[PDB]
Swiss-Prot record, chains A, B:
Tagged with keyword Chaperone: yes
Single GO BP term: response to heat
Record's GO cellular component terms: cytoplasm; cytosol; membrane; TRC complex
Gene behind the chain: SGT2
Chief site of localization: cytoplasm
Covalent S-S links between cysteines: none
UniProt cross-references to PROSITE patterns, sorted A to Z: TPR, TPR_REGION
Similarity comment text for this entry: Belongs to the SGT family.
Protein name according to UniProt: Small glutamine-rich tetratricopeptide repeat-containing protein 2
GO molecular function: identical protein binding; molecular adaptor activity
Species: Saccharomyces cerevisiae (strain ATCC 204508 / S288c) (Baker's yeast)
Quaternary organization: Interacts with HSC82, HSP104, MDY2, SSA1 and SSA2.
InterPro entries: SGT (IPR047150), SGTA_dimer (IPR032374), TPR-like_helical_dom_sf (IPR011990), TPR_rpt (IPR019734)
Signal peptide: none
Length: 347, 347
């Protein structure tokens, strides 16, 4: 290659522009280089200043940088405003207070609950749920209030909801088991007062133990209610020993006896890097358009209608010939025809 | 620092010496490359031939070779066997051996045809047509002989090519008529004979009346009951001056020998570069005083923003696919949307 031999002229004139800029050479010598640039400029039809856009055609496939520094101006370019620094303190700081400010709503709801206002408290604890729902204290408080007000359904729907958030909440189990025992529901009441005996243990009072036993009486009733039916699902029930039932289960053989050389019979390291995919292929590429690389090979033709002489036969006949080995050794020096040869006087 | 400016200069002057001799730039602009490279070699103090030695010492840092090869083999092989040898001194190529060939084929082919030896008549005119394809005489006459050998459609092409050179040659239309006549079209033949008498006008002789009467001997009895009366050929409406190029004639003849520089050869160049006239072509379509906003007052080609990438993007080539892709969104045609201005009176 030699590029399009047009942008080369822009590099040439600008190179001499640098020489005459300093004027290192004689003043008259710089005049020669000066009028030279002037002439090359109008020769291709450009101006010896606006050479930058002309160079934008070939990147010099061998030079690029290092050799010639008189091409690519080392400018980082483009800086307006982008720190790309983290906020840290957060933008939604405004509403972020309500995460902990729901405590005020709780304490104001307690200013209802402790002031005999049951219905008003439950309203204000649901109002505190409206901001922060996930807290067993909200539900189990409404559970305590509802079982008192004989809303045993709502007492449950708060009690097991409070357990679902916190299984250490004693009021959760105590109001669930109370409301469910009042309805007669066995499995609920037993396990609610079991977790009294489990968690509290020595804090678990004799009354709590006795009410656990009294709930177990209801469970004894549900022993004949709760029953998973077989549904007549027959498999081993029907003729399983039918045919030749010698054993449908092998010990190892047909099971997974195939262990010709386990661990050993593995790539292990996998080795899929030194195999094909190390770096060749892909090339990134992307789509830069690059004006028109439709075919884009090189300077085809330009061979021109010049009448070449008989210069093609300058090559001549190979004058080497068998000269060094024309008669050397083999072709002349031959007496080894017979080893005795001059064996005169036989026997 | 990009090596010695003298080493660079030695490559530069040789680089121009090759381009200007190859005639890849016109000699007009090559004179300003000549005086330039002379001022360069003058200034640093070397000859344009002395560069051969300097280029052996100048190995550069980046390129070295291949990206520039004027520091190595700047000449080609030109090595086949008996190419052209450039036939100099005899400058008239179009009349060299050519003129002596075509002339003896003219009158003698005419006398072969007058003997009704159309076989030999064609032989003469075929060689002569190959010599000077600019001579309508050999085409039209060969057409008369070609028609007579039952090759009427082929004879239409000869007669057509005679007209395509010289459409004022009435004897081109003569056997064009005879060809279409013997295709079974007497009335569709008469129009070309009528063109023989049209070009000749009121000076139409008995020798031309023969041609007209050939078709007329049928047509005079035809048009009485059978009327269509077509111009058929038409052709004089697309006369002008025969504004047609050659069909192509590419490579010239493929054998160009090898124009490494040559010595006064036919370039056949600059024809494609010659295309420069410029003419009035706007048309005064001024229906009103404000005929189109030619003031261009912020109107069209405004909304762009540039939105350009950098130069550094050149490192990636679009071998992924290569397409438009980045249309930059568009929607810059926002004018005819009617929402700009609109007008609602407002009272």
């Amino acid at each position: 290659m030699s590029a399009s031999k047009e942008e080369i002229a822009a590099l040439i004139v600008n190179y001499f522009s640098s020489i005459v800029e300093k004027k290192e050479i004689s003043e008259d010598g710089a005049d020669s280089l000066n009028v030279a640039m002037d002439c090359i400029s109008e020769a291709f039809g450009f101006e010896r200043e606006a050479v930058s856009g002309i160079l934008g055609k070939s990147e010099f496939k061998g030079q690029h940088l290092a050799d010639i520094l008189n091409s690519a101006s080392r400018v980082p370019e483009s800086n307006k405003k982008d720190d790309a620094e983290n906020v840290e303190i957060n933008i939604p700081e405004d509403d972020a207070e309500t995460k902990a400010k729901a405590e005020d709503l709780k304490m104001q709801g307690n200013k209802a609950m402790a002031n005999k206002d049951y219905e008003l408290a439950i309203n204000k604890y649901t109002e505190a749920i409206k901001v922060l729902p996930t807290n067993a204290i909200y539900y189990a408080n409404r559970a305590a209030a509802h079982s008192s007000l004989k809303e045993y359904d709502q007492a449950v729907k708060d009690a097991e909801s409070a357990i679902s958030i916190d299984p250490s909440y004693f009021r959760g189990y105590s109001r669930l088991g109370f409301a469910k025992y009042a309805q007669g529901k066995p499995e609920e009441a037993l396990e609610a007062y079991k977790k009294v005996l489990d968690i509290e243990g020595d804090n678990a009072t004799e009354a709590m133990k006795r009410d656990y036993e009294s709930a177990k009486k209801k469970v004894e009733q549900s022993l004949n209610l709760e029953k998973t039916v077989p549904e007549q699902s027959r498999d081993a029930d029907v003729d399983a020993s039918q045919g030749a039932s010698a054993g449908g289960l092998p010990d190892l053989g047909s099971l997974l006896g195939g262990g010709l050389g386990g661990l050993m019979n593995n790539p292990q390291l996998m080795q899929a890097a030194q195999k094909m995919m190390s770096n060749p292929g892909a090339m990134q590429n992307i789509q830069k358009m690059m004006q028109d690389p439709s075919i884009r090979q090189m300077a085809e033709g330009f061979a021109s209608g010049g009448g070449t002489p008989n210069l093609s036969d300058l090559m001549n006949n190979p004058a080497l010939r068998n000269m060094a080995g024309n008669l050397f050794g083999g072709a002349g020096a031959q007496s080894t025809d017979e080893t005795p040869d001059n064996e005169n006087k036989q026997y």
